[PDB]
C-alpha cells in the first residue's frame, strides 16, 4: 500500500519521496503464516521459498526514472533475531538493498544515541551524493580519514587494556583518545538533535585536529589547510 | 633498608654501614631470618653463597617478588658458583 502510495507521489506528481517501513521482521513472520495456510512447504529456516523474491518485489521499487522528476527512496528497518546478520531476514535483504546501517548493543548499552557502528555499516552509492554541487568539497576525502583513524584507534584501545597505557606510543594513545571522543561527540548527537551537513563536516575537522598534520594521508593540499583548525 | 647474611668475618665489615647483618648457620632459620626480612620492607639482601645452599626454597619463593632483592655473594673463602648456574638456566628458559 505504502509503496503504491509512494509511487503515486513521485512518478505521477513529480515529488521526491522517502519511505520508511517497520518492522520488516514482522512482515516475514506474517508472510510465513499465510504460506502454511496455503499448505506450502517452507524453503529455508522456516521461511518460504519466495522470501528473497517477495522482498525484491517491494524493495526494488525505488529510484528515479528517465524523463520524470520523481524520486522514491526506501529506508526499511528490521530486527535481526538475536543480533545475527547470517539470519535469512537481514542476509537476503543484503542481496537486494545497497548497503546497510547497523545498530550495536554494545553502543546503546554505553549510552550512544544513535548506537550506530560505522565499521560494519555501509552505503554502496555514497560517493554519488558527495563532492561540490551536493556537499562540501572535502566530503569524500574526510570520510575515509575519520574511518581509517577510528579502526586504528579501536585497535590502540584493545591493546591498551591488555598491555597497559604505557605500552602505547603516545600518538597511538591520541588515536585512542580520538576514537572515544569520536563516538561520544560525533556519533552521539541525540535522537532529537538535528545536524546539518556543514555542521557535521567541520566537526570531523575539529576531531581530526586532535591528530597532528603528519598522519592525514587521505587529504590533499587544497583541503587540509582550507578547513583544519 | 638493607640486610646481609653470612660469615661474621666476611660480613661484619658491612656493619660499618647501616646493614642489619646476621650470622645465620641454619637451613630453616636462614629462611626465618629472610622471612622476618620479608615482612619488614628491606629493599636488598646480600647473601654469601655458602649460606644459600641452605634454604634454596625461600629465595625461589620471593624470586617472583620484587622485595626482597635476594643477592648471592662470595664469602671470604669463595663462591659456590651460583652465578654460573642462575644466569645460564634463566637465559635459556625465556628464549
Amino acid at each position: 500500500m505504502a509503496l503504491t502510495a509512494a509511487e503515486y507521489l513521485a512518478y505521477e506528481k513529480g515529488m521526491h519521496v522517502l519511505v520508511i517501513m517497520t518492522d520488516m521482521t514482522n512482515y516475514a513472520e506474517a508472510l510465513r503464516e499465510i504460506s502454511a495456510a496455503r499448505r506450502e512447504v517452507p524453503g529455508r529456516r522456516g521461511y518460504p521459498g519466495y522470501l528473497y523474491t517477495n522482498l525484491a518485489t517491494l524493495f526494488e521499487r525505488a529510484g528515479r526514472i528517465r524523463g520524470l522528476k520523481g524520486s522514491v527512496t526506501q529506508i526499511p528497518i528490521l530486527t535481526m533475531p538475536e543480533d545475527d546478520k547470517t539470519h535469512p531476514i537481514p542476509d537476503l535483504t543484503g542481496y537486494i538493498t545497497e548497503g546497510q546501517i547497523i545498530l550495536t548493543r554494545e553502543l546503546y548499552k554505553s549510552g550512544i544515541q544513535p548506537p550506530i557502528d560505522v565499521l560494519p555499516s555501509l552505503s554502496r552509492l555514497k560517493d554519488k551524493g558527495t563532492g561540490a554541487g551536493k556537499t562540501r568539497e572535502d566530503h569524500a576525502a574526510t570520510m575515509n580519514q575519520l574511518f581509517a583513524a577510528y579502526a586504528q584507534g579501536k585497535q590502540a584501545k584493545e591493546l591498551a587494556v591488555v598491555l597497559g597505557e604505557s605500552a602505547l606510543s603516545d600518538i597511538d594513545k591520541i588515536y585512542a583518545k580520538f576514537a572515544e571522543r569520536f563516538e561520544n561527540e560525533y556519533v552521539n548527537q541525540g535522537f532529537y538533535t538535528n545536524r546539518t551537513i556543514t555542521e557535521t563536516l567541520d566537526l570531523g575537522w575539529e576531531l581530526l585536529a586532535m591528530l597532528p598534520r603528519t598522519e592525514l594521508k587521505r587529504i590533499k593540499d587544497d583541503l587540509l589547510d582550507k578547513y583544519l583548525p | 633498608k638493607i640486610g646481609v647474611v653470612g660469615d661474621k668475618d666476611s660480613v661484619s665489615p658491612f656493619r660499618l654501614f647501616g646493614f642489619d647483618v646476621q650470622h645465620g648457620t641454619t637451613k630453616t632459620e636462614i629462611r626465618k631470618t629472610i622471612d622476618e626480612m620479608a615482612k619488614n620492607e628491606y629493599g636488598v639482601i646480600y647473601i654469601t653463597e655458602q649460606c644459600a645452599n641452605l634454604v634454596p626454597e625461600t629465595i625461589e619463593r620471593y624470586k617472583g617478588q620484587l622485595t626482597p632483592a635476594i643477592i648471592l655473594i662470595p664469602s671470604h673463602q669463595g663462591t659456590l658458583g651460583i652465578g654460573l648456574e642462575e644466569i645460564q638456566n634463566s637465559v635459556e628458559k625465556a628464549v
Partner: peptide
C-alpha cells in the same frame, strides 16, 4: 659481566637505600 666482576673484587677483598619500583607493563622494575 657485573656478576663475574663482582666475584673477583669480592675475593681479592646511616646508609640505607630507598627503592621506588618503576614499571614496565607486566612486572614492575
Amino acid at each position: 659481566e657485573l656478576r663475574q666482576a663482582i666475584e673477583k673484587e669480592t675475593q681479592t677483598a646511616n646508609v640505607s637505600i630507598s627503592v621506588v619500583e618503576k614499571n614496565i607493563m607486566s612486572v614492575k622494575v
